[PDB]
Design a protein around this ligand. Structure first.
Ligand code: CLA
Ligand code: CLA
Ligand code: CLA
Ligand code: CLA
Ligand code: CLA
Ligand code: CLA
Ligand code: CLA
Ligand code: CLA
Ligand code: CLA
Ligand SMILES: CCCCCCCCCCCCCCCC(=O)OC[C@H](COP(=O)(O)OC[C@@H](O)CO)OC(=O)CCCCCCCCCCCCCCC
Lengths: 741, 68, 80, 141, 139, 160, 39, 38
């Protein structure tokens, strides 16, 4: 059932098509008569479905392009390890990680940008990085820069290997279509062989390298007298003098005497008091447990030997009275359409990246991660933005599936057919819950603005005023704070200090505090739910109304990416599935901006700060989230106006590049509105006026200048809007937290 | 003087190639209003949004032209 | 109701009729063209105004031309 | 005579700033070189050099020399571009080498583009620079 | 007249007739097929062309011709024998789409000139000529 | 077994789901003052207004500018009377424009023919006025006469 | 032979031109920095 | 709060009249005007 069959040399390797742009499309191959050809060259460069109609060639192109993307990512990772190896103070940071800032990028002194080399400690001048690579390498057991140089060399070798594999799987031995249809083998080798074996190898590394090196690091040994990780394996006496259950061999693993491994495979739960990160024994035990679980899960599906599932009878058996036929047709949908697979995978990866962001702040996995507030804020913000972008792309590719890969013949009375049949009931109730959430999440802020403006502090929605305490989240917090010893009897502490306990503090700064939730947290969580729901509304409305509507019934023939059907029916502007992604990008900007604003204010006001010797915690802003995060004027004054005092006074200092990027993002946000507000027919006429002035001086170009198309005008406007807003928030966050953190 | 291959300038104001010179592809001898098919180097605006192609020929009358 | 007017610079390529989604247009015989036919718009009260016919016209300026006028329940294309 | 603008050497606000001029390059005395090089300009009450733009001499270095230098370079760029655009017209396949630039022709246009004002004056007096209003596409009124 | 037809096997959707279909006007499409196949309604979802002749009701004419385009193109049996009617709530039925029995893209005798101008579109009167009158420059 | 069917006519844009029209929602929507079989207008409006005036003395009595003041229940009564009067003016002008026959759905196959005329909607509006005033005053009297009534202490400790 | 046509394309040549121009300006402002005006 | 200016009770009557009463009257009358047939 699952075998390897390939075609030998299907595409010759020649440079003749490199000099012929637009070869992949028939319409692009006639030649650039207008400048719309140039933008169509890039808009349809990766759309492999519009290029060829054969699914085998499309899957071959996708498989070979994944290797090139992996080569690009490996070049990036090798560059980061090379910057850690050559242009960083990592060896200086390992000696004193509480008073030396992580820096891995020096700036060349050709103009006055030598001021951008911040004084970070240890006689090193450079840009204070916030990527968290230094804490990652400390958790990996890397002690010297030569181990980073070797990893950079290995990353270059792996990137070249991935480039060679991408050339090989498209020009020498390219797999057939049925090599892709057996997703059973693919999923078994991705669960057990990629996630399972990868986490098992990382569990073994954390047993043999990360745990002894990090225990010697926390015990007070300088890193250049710390032994290299290979004599821990070559000489097990040095490995067994600490955590003395390595004196006995591997036989307690095989006789199921796992309990004697409890000294280095713990379930402590909380944070390390020395470093502020998670216990690396907990991480090694976690990786071993999920490695066993993923390897077990990778034996579920039938590949070649009769045992296993076929992922179709699972779908065929799942059917109810409210649905009828069930999941019949979904296996063919997910094994014949790449866009449905991308819509599922991109949504789950986006929600996964958001889970990563929401987890790494509360349970910091790395030593001295929670101490450096800039790293924690940057990784939270970065992973929220990446996750939301992936979720909106999932909505996009669901819309592309619906008009280009959906077949009504294979979908009669299944789940997808019935979703299309009651899409009005779906979208109208989603519209109602969006309106309800908008009123009862934002009108609370409007009411609070009004009563704080009218001198009525007792009529507000505050802790002193009418309370709106989130009793369910507080009950869940009380359940998690009491979870250790009652519902998790073998945990030393809770999973995080967020839900309760005491202030975990490292050095003089707070690693983590309990995060109490009040009226402001209730109101901002309802705004989070509201903005997420409206993004869901636009994206799901684009998905369900992608093929047809009451307005335009023949909308599948127009395609995924078309501007409009015309000024008729009142004006059918932005009816396509693409334009719902275009609007959902604005709404994910709004949603994730409110999310990272809630994070950057709640942690600065109620978690982050210094510890007085008396024991009390003096936070960064002073606990003003309880009384000012209930009003829009409080969010404008005590968060946006107050905390941007660092980004605007950064000029003539080491953080002036952040003020430059702040102004640059303001420029790009304002620049977006020229494309967003205007339309094509203005600019075509303006270019017509310019063409005559070129014709007057024999400056007529051969490629005739056209204005950007309506979809391209919207794409340029939304890309500039997101870029200018995100660069602005990045600059504001980083310059604030590199001054107060 | 209007014959196939002769370069000719358009006198229709509303045309894309008003006061521009194109070649003659064919002239129809039957009694139709616009018999002279003229093909141009440049392309018209015609097409959907985002279309990289456009038409480059049209029928014209005798009085809508002048021979260069 | 919208006004769909067909002018005499029509080559009879029938692209406007095939592009029309509400059967507003049709072909009538015409002695003034090589194709022997011109577009006509009899049931122009069904015109929504999408200008798909104006999109498909291959003339330098369009022989078929839609003028958006009074709005009815069919010009709006309302199912309700 | 600009009595409000003092020379930077005689200005007592420029000399306070000129101690703390930061180095821009790897050269250690780059701040001192900037301080001595900017002293010939005119400084206001702030202590920062000002540029007077009216074409006078002893202040022609503010605008007239950089302006004439830019005019020469921009005329070079525009004339080489116009020469390449004209040269690729009358050879029946112009969009393909509009999109994929013919390098051996572009090099010969570029390196012989230093004599752009002589060729511009020749094309202006010859009438081959400007297209007559009859032979040019004009939009309807 | 009286529309003898059976309805395709459809599970019912929410995109179909609203309240104005029984009060202002609704539309119908009848088509004869010699085989049983699956089609997509403009209403939403997929339904079954049963063997023989079919009758469907829609709220708009555009939905009926969006169905008729799906009946003509994209089907191997190549169904052209479809007729589109308009039903007012009084009971009157107006036969609409193939009025001559032939499709509008094919020329037929007996059709007269509608909306045809015997003038160039550039040779239109200026609005300043037609000020303060009901006539607009495209008349 | 398809529990989600159509209403008998599939090409009408509605579905007969359990929530929509199964057995318990056809009754209790056909047995509400609107859609009940035997009631005349100025009786449907009376019942609807009484229920509405009674429920609307909940976010005005304990949620207002005067809710910490002994005039708070009286101000809530006056606000409920004002809202009922505004809604009666809205009903009266909606009828005075001219009403059509109400929309027949799967849940309500028979709509009241007496509300399809302007005279019926005037009786409905008058009944709504009398019912709203009566319900608001009854809720005011019930909330005011024990003067504490600790059920009002609930949902005012919540709405503190 | 087909590689030189790809290197003769508009993006490759505009990137080479912009890198050459930026490198010339950067090498000028390194060796001769801080030229606000001609002396 | 009543003012020290003459006829301080006139804001207590005209402001609710111009802010509540006559806008309700104008919206009712304009609604009947713009929604009446023929
Ligand atoms: C635009 C893409 C982008 C960029 C540039 C980065 C860049 C960053 N990430 Mg990130 N990431 C992204 C997307 C992105 N990520 C996505 C889509 C995910 C979801 C899978 C993650 C999840 C992720 C985690 C979990 C962590 C990073 C971290 C890092 C930082 C250091 C990089 C490093 O060496 O970490 C190396 C880190 C690891 C090798 C740990 C990752 C191991 C994960 C848990 C296994 C994932 C397996 C597989 C690939 C995913 C399968 C999905 C499953 C549902 C099937 C850096 C700021 C790290 C950080 O913040 O450190 C301070 C960190 O721990 N990222
Ligand atoms: C244990 C077996 C095994 C392992 C290691 C993987 C691992 C991988 N496969 Mg693969 N695959 C397998 C068997 C295997 N596959 C089988 C049997 C099938 C055939 C049915 C597939 C078919 C398949 C497809 C078609 C695709 C993948 C892709 C991927 C990559 C996921 C991207 C990523 O997160 O990389 C991070 C992890 C690494 C870089 C570790 C590499 C480990 C080396 C190879 C050992 C990764 C290299 C995707 C990809 O990116 O293509 C390149 C993709 O397109 N695989
Ligand atoms: C894929 C991961 C992996 C790999 C390759 C290794 C590698 C090895 N393990 Mg193991 N180890 C791992 C997972 C891993 N382990 C995990 C998850 C556990 C926890 C159950 C342990 C617990 C462990 C113990 C208790 C010991 C080994 C030891 C050994 C060594 C075998 C004997 C020898 O070479 O001397 C070898 C280096 C032995 C050794 O020599 O340690 C230095 C040893 O005594 N391992
Ligand atoms: C409450 C929801 C629910 C119900 C009623 C069912 C019902 C069904 N499941 Mg199950 N199942 C569900 C959710 C549920 N499942 C979930 C959430 C998962 C994914 C984690 C699965 C995974 C699953 C698989 C892998 C298989 C079934 C199958 C079965 C069938 C036999 C019952 C059995 O042994 O598994 C009961 C299992 C649970 C209640 C869990 C039955 C039709 C089998 C099948 O295909 O039968 C035809 C089978 O192969 N289930
Ligand atoms: C696993 C990820 C994944 C994959 C591979 C796909 C795959 C594809 N997408 Mg995409 N998509 C995704 C994620 C993904 N996308 C996400 C995250 C988004 C949300 C924004 C979408 C939204 C989406 C839409 C809306 C559409 C696609 C389409 C496409 C197709 C062709 C793309 C192309 O040629 O455009 C290449 C175009 C570019 C590379 C231009 C991108 C320009 C960006 C804004 C610049 C990058 C930002 C950068 C940091 C700015 C620096 C500025 C500095 C240089 C000055 C292809 C199927 C298109 C399609 O199928 O058409 C039918 C389509 O229209 N995508
Ligand atoms: C501040 C800017 C702003 C505001 C007010 C809105 C308003 C709205 N957006 Mg949004 N949106 C914006 C900018 C804005 N947007 C921009 C930049 C774009 C991006 C391109 C869009 C595009 C967009 C789309 C794509 C969608 C919306 C939708 C919505 C609605 C969400 C439902 C809701 O919250 O109702 C509650 C209303 C509010 C919270 C607004 C404040 C009103 C307060 C709370 C009440 C005050 C009323 C007052 C008492 C009346 C008495 C005064 C009297 C004198 C008249 C809402 C009407 C969605 C929608 O309509 O579906 C539900 C949707 O689909 N938006
Ligand atoms: C041969 C190239 C060339 C030449 C000489 C001209 C010359 C002219 N243009 Mg310009 N222009 C060009 C290319 C050119 N342009 C291109 C590529 C663009 C698109 C960005 C425009 C868009 C444009 C606008 C929007 C405007 C002008 C204007 C003008 C006039 C005043 C100069 C000016 O404002 O510069 C402005 C120049 C730019 C904004 C961009 C120029 C880009 C470079 C410098 C052109 C040369 C490099 C070229 C790409 C490659 C050279 C070929 C090489 C292989 C040999 C003048 C008639 C203005 C006008 O009508 O005044 C009467 C007017 O409003 N032009
Ligand atoms: C903003 C929401 C709100 C508020 C704060 C209240 C508050 C009030 N209502 Mg009310 N009510 C509400 C919404 C509201 N209502 C709605 C939506 C309905 C319809 C389900 C009702 C139906 C209702 C009835 C049926 C009764 C109350 C009663 C009450 C009073 C005592 C509550 C009680 O017994 O608690 C414990 C109090 C004045 C009682 C009342 O008015 O008696 C004086 C009573 O009998 N209300
Ligand atoms: C568009 C407006 C514009 C203007 C008028 C200037 C003008 C100037 N800038 Mg600049 N600047 C601008 C925008 C502009 N800039 C922007 C957009 C940025 C932000 C990215 C900067 C950032 C910036 C910095 C950081 C620096 C300047 C400096 C310079 C000065 C000399 C640069 C140089 O190398 O000259 C010398 C060049 C030549 C002599 C040309 C020789 C080679 C030519 C091409 C060939 C000639 C052949 C005959 C000059 C005053 C530098 C300076 O000295 O500050 C005062 C400096 O360090 N600029
Ligand atoms: C968790 C999600 C709650 C889902 C409601 C369960 C109820 C549910 O699962 O119904 C159960 C029912 C399942 O029907 P069957 O028994 O036919 O299902 C067989 C399945 O195996 C699918 O083939 O689903 C439907 O009929 C969908 C109706 C959802 C319509 C209700 C709208 C739900 C969205 C709004 C509620 C949101 C609450 C969100 C809280 C986070």
């Amino acid at each position: 059932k699952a075998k390897v069959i390939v075609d030998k040399d299907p595409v010759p390797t020649s440079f003749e098509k490199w000099g012929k742009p637009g070869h992949f499309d028939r319409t692009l191959a006639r030649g650039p008569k207008t400048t719309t050809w140039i933008w169509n060259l890039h808009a349809d460069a990766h759309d492999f479905d519009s290029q060829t109609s054969d699914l085998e060639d499309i899957s071959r192109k996708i498989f070979s392009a994944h290797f090139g993307h992996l080569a690009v990512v490996f070049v990036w990772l090798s560059g980061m390890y090379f910057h850690g190896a050559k242009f960083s103070n990592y060896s200086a940071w390992l000696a004193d990680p509480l008073n030396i800032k992580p820096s891995a990028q020096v700036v060349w002194p050709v103009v006055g940008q030598d001021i951008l080399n911040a004084d970070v400690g240890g006689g090193f001048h450079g840009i204070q990085i916030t990527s968290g690579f230094f804490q990652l390498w400390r958790a990996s057991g890397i002690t010297n820069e030569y181990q980073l140089y070797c990893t950079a060399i290995g990353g270059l070798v792996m990137a070249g290997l991935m480039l060679f594999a991408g050339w090989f799987h498209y020009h020498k031995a390219a797999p057939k279509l049925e090599w892709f249809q057996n997703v059973e083998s693919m999923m078994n080798h991705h669960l057990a062989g990629l996630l399972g074996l990868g986490s098992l190898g990382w569990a073994g590394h954390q047993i043999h390298v990360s745990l002894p090196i990090n225990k010697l690091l926390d015990a007070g040994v300088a890193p250049n007298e710390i032994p290299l990780p290979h004599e821990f394996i070559l000489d097990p006496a040095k490995m067994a003098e600490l955590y003395p259950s390595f004196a006995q061999g591997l036989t307690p693993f095989f006789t199921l005497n796992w309990g004697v491994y409890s000294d280095f495979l713990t379930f402590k739960g909380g944070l390390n008091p020395v470093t502020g990160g998670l216990w690396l024994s907990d991480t090694a035990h976690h990786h071993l447990a999920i490695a066993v679980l993923f390897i077990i899960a990778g034996h579920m599906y039938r590949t070649n030997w009769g045992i296993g599932h076929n992922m179709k009878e699972i779908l065929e058996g799942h059917k109810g009275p409210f649905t009828g036929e069930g999941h019949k047709g979904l296996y063919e949908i997910l094994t014949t359409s790449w866009h449905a697979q991308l819509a599922i995978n991109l949504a789950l990866l986006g929600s996964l990246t958001i889970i990563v962001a929401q987890h790494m702040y509360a349970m910091p996995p790395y030593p001295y991660l929670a101490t450096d507030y800039g790293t924690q804020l940057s990784i939270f913000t970065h992973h929220m933005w990446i996750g939301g972008f992936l979720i909106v792309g999932a909505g996009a590719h669901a819309s592309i599936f619906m008009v280009r890969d959906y077949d009504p013949a294979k979908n009669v009375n299944n789940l997808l057919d019935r979703v299309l049949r009651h899409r009005d009931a779906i979208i109208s109730h989603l519209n109602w819950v969006c309106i309800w959430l908008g009123f009862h999440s934002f009108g609370l802020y409007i009411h609070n603005d009004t009563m704080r403006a009218l001198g009525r502090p007792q009529d507000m929605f505050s802790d002193s005023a009418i309370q709106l305490q989130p009793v369910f989240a507080q009950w869940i917090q009380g359940l998690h704070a009491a979870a250790a010893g009652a519902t998790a009897p073998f945990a030393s502490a809770g999973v995080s200090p967020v839900f309760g306990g005491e202030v975990v503090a490292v050095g003089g700064k707070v690693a983590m505090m309990p995060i109490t939730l009040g009226t402001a947290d209730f109101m901002v969580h309802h705004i989070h739910a509201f903005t997420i729901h409206v993004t869901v509304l636009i994206l799901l409305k684009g998905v369900l109304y992608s093929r047809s509507s009451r307005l335009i019934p023949d909308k599948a023939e127009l395609g995924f990416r078309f501007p409009c059907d015309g000024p008729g029916r009142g004006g059918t502007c932005q009816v396509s599935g693409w334009d719902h992604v275009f609007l959902g990008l604005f709404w994910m900007y709004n949603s994730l901006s409110i999310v990272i604003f809630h994070f950057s204010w709640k942690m600065q006001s109620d978690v982050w700060g210094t510890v007085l010797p008396d024991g009390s915690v003096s936070h960064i802003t002073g606990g003003n989230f309880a009384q000012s995060a209930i009003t829009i004027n409080g969010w404008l004054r005590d968060f946006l106006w107050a905390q941007a005092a660092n980004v605007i006074n950064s000029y003539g200092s080491a953080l002036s590049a952040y003020g430059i990027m702040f102004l640059a993002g303001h420029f790009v946000f304002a620049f977006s509105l020229m494309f967003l507000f205007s339309g094509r027919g203005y600019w075509q006429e303006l270019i017509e006026s310019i063409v005559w002035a070129h014709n007057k001086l024999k400056l007529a170009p051969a490629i005739q200048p056209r204005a950007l198309s309506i979809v391209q005008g919207r794409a340029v406007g939304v890309a500039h809007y997101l870029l200018g807003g995100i660069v602005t928030t990045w600059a504001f966050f980083l310059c604030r937290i590199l001054s107060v953190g | 003087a209007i014959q196939r291959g002769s370069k000719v300038r358009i006198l229709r104001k509303e045309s894309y190639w008003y006061k521009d010179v194109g070649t003659v592809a064919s002239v129809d001898k039957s009694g139709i209003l616009y018999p002279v098919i003229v093909r141009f180097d440049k392309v018209n605006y015609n097409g959907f949004s985002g279309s990289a192609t456009g038409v480059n020929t049209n029928n014209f009358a005798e009085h809508e032209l002048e021979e260069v | 109701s919208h006004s769909v007017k067909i002018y005499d610079t029509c080559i009879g390529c029938t692209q406007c009729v095939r592009a029309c989604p509400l059967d507003v247009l049709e072909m009538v015989p015409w002695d003034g063209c090589k194709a022997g036919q011109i577009a006509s718009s009899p049931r122009t009260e069904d015109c929504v105004g999408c200008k798909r016919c104006e999109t498909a016209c291959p003339t330098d300026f369009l022989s078929i031309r839609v003028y958006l006028g009074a709005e009815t329940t069919r010009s709006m294309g309302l199912a309700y | 005579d600009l009595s409000h603008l003092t020379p930077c050497s005689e200005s007592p606000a420029y000399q306070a700033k000129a101690k703390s001029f930061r180095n821009t390059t790897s050269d250690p005395e780059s701040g001192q070189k900037r301080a001595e090089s900017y002293a010939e300009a005119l400084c206001g009450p702030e202590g920062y050099p000002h540029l007077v733009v009216d074409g006078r001499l002893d202040h022609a270095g503010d605008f007239i020399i950089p302006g004439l230098l830019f005019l020469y370079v921009a005329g070079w760029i525009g004339w080489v571009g116009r020469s390449y655009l004209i040269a690729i017209r009358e050879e029946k396949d112009t969009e393909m080498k509009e999109i994929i630039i013919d390098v051996p022709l572009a090099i010969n246009k570029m390196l012989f583009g230093f004599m752009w004002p002589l060729q511009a004056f020749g094309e202006f007096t010859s009438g081959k620079l400007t297209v007559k209003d009859s032979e040019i596409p004009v939009s309807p009124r | 007249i009286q529309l003898t037809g059976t309805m395709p096997k459809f599970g019912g959707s929410t995109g179909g007739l609203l309240s104005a279909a029984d009060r202002e006007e609704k539309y119908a499409i009848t088509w004869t097929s010699k085989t049983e196949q699956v089609f997509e309604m403009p209403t939403g979802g997929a339904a079954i062309m049963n063997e023989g002749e079919n009758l469907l009701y829609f709220a708009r004419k555009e939905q009926c011709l969006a169905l008729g385009t799906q009946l003509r193109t994209k089907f191997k049996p190549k169904i052209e024998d479809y007729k589109i009617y308009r039903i007012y709530p009084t009971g009157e039925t107006q036969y609409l789409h193939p009025a001559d029995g032939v499709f509008p893209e094919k020329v037929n005798e007996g059709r007269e000139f509608h909306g045809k101008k015997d003038r160039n579109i550039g040779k239109n009167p200026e609005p300043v000529t037609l000020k303060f009158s009901g006539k607009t420059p495209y008349d | 077994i398809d529990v989600v069917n159509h209403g008998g006519d599939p090409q009408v844009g509605n579905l007969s789901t359990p929530i929509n029209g199964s057995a318990f929602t056809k009754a209790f929507i056909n047995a509400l003052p609107a859609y009940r079989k035997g009631l005349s207008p100025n009786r449907r409006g009376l019942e609807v207004g009484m229920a509405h005036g009674y429920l609307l003395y909940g976010p005005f009595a304990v949620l207002g500018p005067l809710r910490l003041t002994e005039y708070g229940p009286t101000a809530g009564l006056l606000a409920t009377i004002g809202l009922v009067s505004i809604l009666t003016i809205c009903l009266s002008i909606y009828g005075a424009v001219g009403v059509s026959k109400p929309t027949e759905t799967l849940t309500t196959p028979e709509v009241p023919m007496d509300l399809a005329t302007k005279e019926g909607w005037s009786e409905f509006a008058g009944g709504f006025l009398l019912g709203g005033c009566g319900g608001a005053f009854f809720a005011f009297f019930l909330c005011q006469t024990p003067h504490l009534q600790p059920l009002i202490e609930v949902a005012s400790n919540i709405w503190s | 032979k087909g590689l030189t046509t790809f290197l003769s394309t508009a993006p490759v040549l505009i990137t080479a031109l912009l890198v050459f121009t930026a490198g010339l300006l950067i090498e000028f402002n390194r060796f001769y920095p801080d030229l606000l005006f001609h002396p | 709060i009543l003012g020290d200016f003459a006829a301080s009770f006139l804001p207590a009557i005209l402001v609710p009249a111009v802010g509540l009463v006559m806008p309700a009257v104008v919206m009712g009358l304009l609604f009947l005007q713009i929604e009446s047939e023929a």
